RNA sequence: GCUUGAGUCUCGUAGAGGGGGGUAGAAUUCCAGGUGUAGCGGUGAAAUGCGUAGAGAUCUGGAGGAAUACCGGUGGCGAAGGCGGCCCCCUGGACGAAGACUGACGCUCAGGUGCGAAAGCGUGGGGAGCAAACAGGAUUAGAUACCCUGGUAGUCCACGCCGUAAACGAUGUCGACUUGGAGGUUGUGCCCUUGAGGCGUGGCUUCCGGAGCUAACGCGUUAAGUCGACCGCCUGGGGAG
RNA sequence: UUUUUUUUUUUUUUUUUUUU
């Protein structure tokens, strides 16, 4: 989760951590999690995506 | 691919987010993938396959 | 099928005979081969054969007329312990006179008509109509 | 569950001519020595009910294969009990 | 004779203590009559996490054909040893004999 | 009472369902090495410890110090002690001698008794805590390092060795877990011997509090010639403390020697 | 006399293990002291603490409480429930097989036997983080409130009377059923294994196919159309649990 | 799968016969 910038003119190379760890980890957790009802929902969504 | 000397040559299947990519991209036989999965597991917990960037 | 000897004989001639086949084949049994015989000789089936003589299989040429089962109006009425033994004038006389039923008694398996005329009652196997 | 010191000795004692090792008086002598061995080491592990239903099932069979043998063959049955007891 | 793949982590700079300390761990395995398929000095290698502060260990791995009667004794004499960072035990699905 | 042997009270057939029913722990004679405890209070003169009735103390178990460490030993019996509810046992040491030791729940077989500097980690007489591993159970604790057993009894007071705390200043116990005393003190292992005699009421009465003494029974109620209350007519009704000294919270200590308590979270 | 229903050996093969064991790892409280000065939480709008007796945070030194974060799944097991890391022991079920040995020792069950989600009884406690009650500040047509900091119980359970309700093919016991053909998976027989599996073929599962049966949705053979061994429930409103 | 911009609004009586 540790990422340089070089010559730092505010390069904005910092962007690739969106792949999971920075950006994806909020699926469960925001204040608060979802608590009840997210488990069969993960595999329910596999059917909305067939297109 | 059940044991050590081959998984140090197969780190190609680690996508940039630091995790093992779904085989759609080459297309491997189930027996061979399900072997390499356990070869990977022993190399994970022993840090001989040093999982993602800072570890 | 062993919970009701010999009941599957009446189900199998309903099943295959609905299900597009001119044929059905099965292991033989102590009442089935006499039933196969009477069904031909009245003509509800086209033939029967029996095959592998020393431990034989039992084979019936079903009568696939219009693609519908001849033995669609059929009922096997006598069941385990709760038997159906009826006197020579209590016998079936169904369909306002057109008939028929298949029975068994003191001379073999036969039709109810041929039973009434020999003057005997018996074991009501099935109402063929 | 016992050693081939006792079980070759069971085959020698309860067989009759050739290949009897799984036959009805050999299988019952088997099963009465096997319980009577498990009764020596079941004393251990103190929570052993994972194991136990085997010991239990195989004694219900010892009682049952005897109920059968009486009906089947009255000589077989009656000559077996004077060597193994087991009528219980 | 379970094929115990055991990785143990000792203090990093004690290069003079450890050659003999492997002799003071193998001494439990020969007692058993159990036997060493592989036994690896992994060296002063760095750490995945900050455990016991000197940011390296002296790593040792072995693959022992040794019985269950030794492994709670091994676990103890790693754990009671104040020079042991962490130690872990994998087992079976054949033996490893090839170095890492 | 959920252990074994639990020994339950009788059916309701008599006035005494409890006391304790344990077979196999009274014996006689009172064996060669013994003594008693003396008369009534007799402090000289106007006695300060109330209600008395002080007959039959009576006999006590004479083994303290217990410093017989590395001479190995074995176990004839276990007994009771009614002064402490304890599981005390007959320990034959293989030099040529018999003792009376504060043993845990079922320490017999006749077992492998032996202790001391480095020599053992087993069931073990009196054992220096600096020499041995971490554990939950400890028991004896020489109350300051050469004095003697802090606990003369195995009644459930788990005093617990912590590992590398403060240079050897171990124990994690009851009313103040930063008691901080050196691992140069001696353990025995361990604190559960007789749970049964103390996990249940013995009686309302039983012999333990009427054949040879009286307990407390009154202080405030009846006759104002004592406590700060209270007129009569069954009314009382006032502000009446435990004078001059206080009660339901305050504390009493400032200074003293040792006085190692360091945090004492209270409640 | 057999068809071998039924088992015990022989021989193999893995997972989120029925019960005891060993126990790997982010945050973050609040402290010993290492600091920057006034501002940190909180909201439809903010509040009661708080701030020249310095709003966190952030290092370094320490004292406590002990989820399973994932090769973790586009999945795996299981009688239900119901566990998520891995291991030592008791080693459930199984169940892929050269066979050996006996020939129905069988299926399926009521009263009972075990198990038993919610909950009370515990008897002594293990006493994080969150959040019913607890306790208020607040939004006040009354909030007896939902916030927001603070808050236990629920987390789980040695051990045991536990009935029990939403654990529905609105549905057991099952063998015969052989137009089938299509996938999702598992183990496996045979191939110059030049191969994405070709020819096969059971199991685990789903897809959803005629003659019939037939309202309307369509269900279309293992499915309600035949044939059946019962341990059953089924006595109409409202009387009731 | 965060869905409180205020809570409440009295009974009637409509009602084109009938077998098909």
UniProtKB/Swiss-Prot annotation, chain C:
GO terms for cellular component: ribonucleoprotein complex; ribosome. One of its GO terms (molecular function) is structural constituent of ribosome. Pfam families: Ribosomal_S8 (PF00410). InterPro entries: Ribosomal_uS8, Ribosomal_uS8_CS, Ribosomal_uS8_sf. GO terms for biological process: translation. Keywords: Ribonucleoprotein, Ribosomal protein, RNA-binding, rRNA-binding. PROSITE patterns: RIBOSOMAL_S8. Belongs to the universal ribosomal protein uS8 family. NCBIfam families: PRK00136.1. One of the primary rRNA binding proteins, it binds directly to 16S rRNA central domain where it helps coordinate assembly of the platform of the 30S subunit. Part of the 30S ribosomal subunit. Contacts proteins S5 and S12. This is Small ribosomal subunit protein uS8. It comes from Shigella sonnei (strain Ss046). The gene is rpsH.
From Swiss-Prot, chain D:
Part of the 30S ribosomal subunit. Forms a bridge to the 50S subunit in the 70S ribosome, contacting the 23S rRNA. This is Small ribosomal subunit protein uS15. Pfam families: Ribosomal_S15. Belongs to the universal ribosomal protein uS15 family. The gene is rpsO. GO terms for biological process: translation. InterPro entries: Ribosomal_uS15, Ribosomal_uS15_bac-type, uS15_NS1_RNA-bd_sf. It comes from the Bacteria. One of the primary rRNA binding proteins, it binds directly to 16S rRNA where it helps nucleate assembly of the platform of the 30S subunit by binding and bridging several RNA helices of the 16S rRNA. Forms an intersubunit bridge (bridge B4) with the 23S rRNA of the 50S subunit in the ribosome. One of its GO terms (molecular function) is structural constituent of ribosome.
Swiss-Prot record, chain E:
The keyword Metal-binding does not apply. The modification N6-acetyllysine is found at residue 93. One of its GO terms (biological process) is cytoplasmic translation. The keyword Acetylation applies. Keywords: Acetylation, Ribonucleoprotein, Ribosomal protein, RNA-binding, rRNA-binding. It comes from the Bacteria. 5 different forms of the protein, varying only in the number of C-terminal glutamate residues, were isolated. The sequence shown is form bS6-6, which is the longest. The first two Glu are encoded by the rpsF gene, the other Glu are added post-translationally by the RimK enzyme. GO terms for cellular component: cytoplasm; cytosol; cytosolic small ribosomal subunit. One of its GO terms (molecular function) is structural constituent of ribosome. Part of the 30S ribosomal subunit. Interacts weakly with uL2 in one of the 3.5 A resolved structures. Binds together with bS18 to 16S ribosomal RNA. Belongs to the bacterial ribosomal protein bS6 family. This is Small ribosomal subunit protein bS6.
Curated annotation (Swiss-Prot), chain F:
Part of the 50S ribosomal subunit. Forms a bridge to the 30S subunit in the 70S ribosome, contacting the 16S rRNA. Interacts weakly with S6 in one of the 3.5 A resolved structures. In pull-down experiments interacts with CedA. One of its GO terms (molecular function) is RNA binding. GO terms for cellular component: cytoplasm; cytosol; cytosolic large ribosomal subunit; DnaA-L2 complex. One of its GO terms (biological process) is negative regulation of DNA-templated DNA replication initiation. This protein can be partially replaced in vivo by its H.marismortui (HmaL2) or human (L8, from the 60S cytoplasmic ribosome) homolog. The keyword Ribosomal protein applies. Keywords: Acetylation, Ribonucleoprotein, Ribosomal protein, RNA-binding, rRNA-binding. InterPro entries: NA-bd_OB-fold, Rib_uL2_dom2, Ribosomal_uL2, Ribosomal_uL2_bac/org-type, Ribosomal_uL2_C, Ribosomal_uL2_CS, Ribosomal_uL2_dom3, Ribosomal_uL2_RNA-bd_dom. This is Large ribosomal subunit protein uL2. Belongs to the universal ribosomal protein uL2 family. SMART domains: Ribosomal_L2 (SM01383), Ribosomal_L2_C (SM01382). Residues 36-45 have a biased composition (Low complexity). It comes from Escherichia coli (strain K12).
């Amino acid at each position: 989760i540790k990422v340089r910038e070089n010559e730092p003119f505010d390069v904005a190379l910092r962007r690739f951590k969106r792949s999971c760890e920075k950006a994806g980890v909020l699926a469960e957790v925001r204040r608060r999690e979802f608590y009840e009802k997210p488990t069969t929902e993960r595999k329910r969504a596999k059917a909305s995506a067939v297109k | 691919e059940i044991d050590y000397k081959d998984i140090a040559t197969l780190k190609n299947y680690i996508t940039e987010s630091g995790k093992i990519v779904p085989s759609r991209i080459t297309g491997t036989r189930a027996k061979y993938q399900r072997q390499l999965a356990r070869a990977i597991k022993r190399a994970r917990y022993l840090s001989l396959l040093p999982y993602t960037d800072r570890h | 099928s062993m919970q009701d000897p010999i009941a599957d004989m009446l189900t199998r001639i309903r099943n295959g005979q609905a299900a597009n086949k001119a044929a059905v084949t099965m292991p033989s049994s102590k009442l089935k081969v006499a039933i196969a015989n009477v069904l031909k000789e009245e003509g509800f089936i086209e033939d029967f054969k029996v095959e592998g003589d020393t431990k034989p299989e039992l084979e019936l040429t079903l009568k696939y007329f219009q693609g519908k089962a001849v033995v669609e109006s059929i009922q096997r009425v006598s069941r385990p312990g709760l038997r159906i033994y009826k006197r020579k004038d209590e016998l079936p006389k169904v369909m306002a006179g057109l008939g028929i039923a298949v029975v068994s008694t003191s001379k073999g398996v036969m039709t109810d008509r041929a039973a009434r005329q020999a003057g005997l009652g018996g074991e009501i196997i099935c109402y063929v109509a | 569950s016992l050693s081939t010191e006792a079980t070759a000795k069971i085959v020698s004692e309860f067989g009759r001519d050739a290949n009897d090792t799984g036959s009805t008086e050999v299988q019952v002598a088997l099963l009465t020595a096997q319980i009577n061995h498990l009764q020596g080491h079941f004393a251990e592990h103190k929570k052993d009910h994972h194991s136990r239903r085997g010991l239990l099932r195989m004694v219900s069979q010892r009682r049952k294969l005897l109920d059968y043998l009486k009906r089947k063959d009255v000589a077989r049955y009656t000559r077996l009990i004077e060597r193994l007891g087991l009528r219980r | 004779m379970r094929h115990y793949e055991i990785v143990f982590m000792v203090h990093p700079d004690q290069s003079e203590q450890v050659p003999g300390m492997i002799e003071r761990y193998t001494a439990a395995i020969t007692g058993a009559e159990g036997k060493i398929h592989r036994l690896e000095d992994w060296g002063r290698r760095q750490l995945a996490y900050p455990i016991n502060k000197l940011h390296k260990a002296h790593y040792v791995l072995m693959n022992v054909e040794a019985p269950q009667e030794v492994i709670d004794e091994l676990e103890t004499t790693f754990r009671f040893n104040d020079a042991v960072i962490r130690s872990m035990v994998m087992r079976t699905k054949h033996a490893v004999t090839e170095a890492s | 009472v959920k252990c074994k042997p639990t020994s339950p009270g009788r059916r309701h057939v008599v006035k005494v369902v409890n006391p304790e029913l344990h077979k196999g722990k009274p014996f006689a004679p009172l064996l060669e090495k013994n003594s008693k405890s003396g008369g009534r209070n007799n402090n000289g003169r106007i006695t300060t410890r109330h209600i008395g009735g002080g007959h039959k103390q009576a006999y006590r178990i004479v083994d303290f110090k217990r410093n017989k460490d590395g001479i190995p030993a074995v176990v004839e019996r276990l007994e009771y002690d009614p002064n402490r509810s304890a599981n005390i046992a007959l320990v034959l040491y293989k030099d040529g001698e018999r003792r009376y030791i504060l043993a845990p729940k079922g320490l017999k077989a006749g077992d492998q008794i032996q202790s001391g500097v480095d020599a053992a980690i087993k069931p073990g007489n009196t054992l220096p805590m600096r020499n041995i591993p971490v554990g939950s159970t400890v028991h004896n604790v020489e109350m300051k390092p050469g004095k003697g057993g802090q606990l003369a009894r195995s009644a459930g007071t788990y005093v617990q060795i912590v590992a590398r705390d403060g240079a050897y200043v171990t124990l994690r116990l009851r009313s103040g877990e930063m008691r901080k005393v050196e691992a140069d003190c001696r353990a025995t292992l361990g604190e559960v011997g007789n749970a049964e005699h103390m996990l249940r009421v013995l009686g309302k009465a039983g012999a333990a509090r009427w054949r040879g003494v009286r307990p407390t029974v009154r202080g405030t109620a009846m006759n104002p010639v004592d406590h700060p209350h209270g007129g009569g007519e069954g009314r009382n009704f006032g502000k009446h403390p435990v004078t001059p000294w206080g009660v339901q919270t305050k504390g009493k200590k400032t200074r003293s020697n040792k006085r190692t308590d360091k945090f004492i979270v209270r409640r």
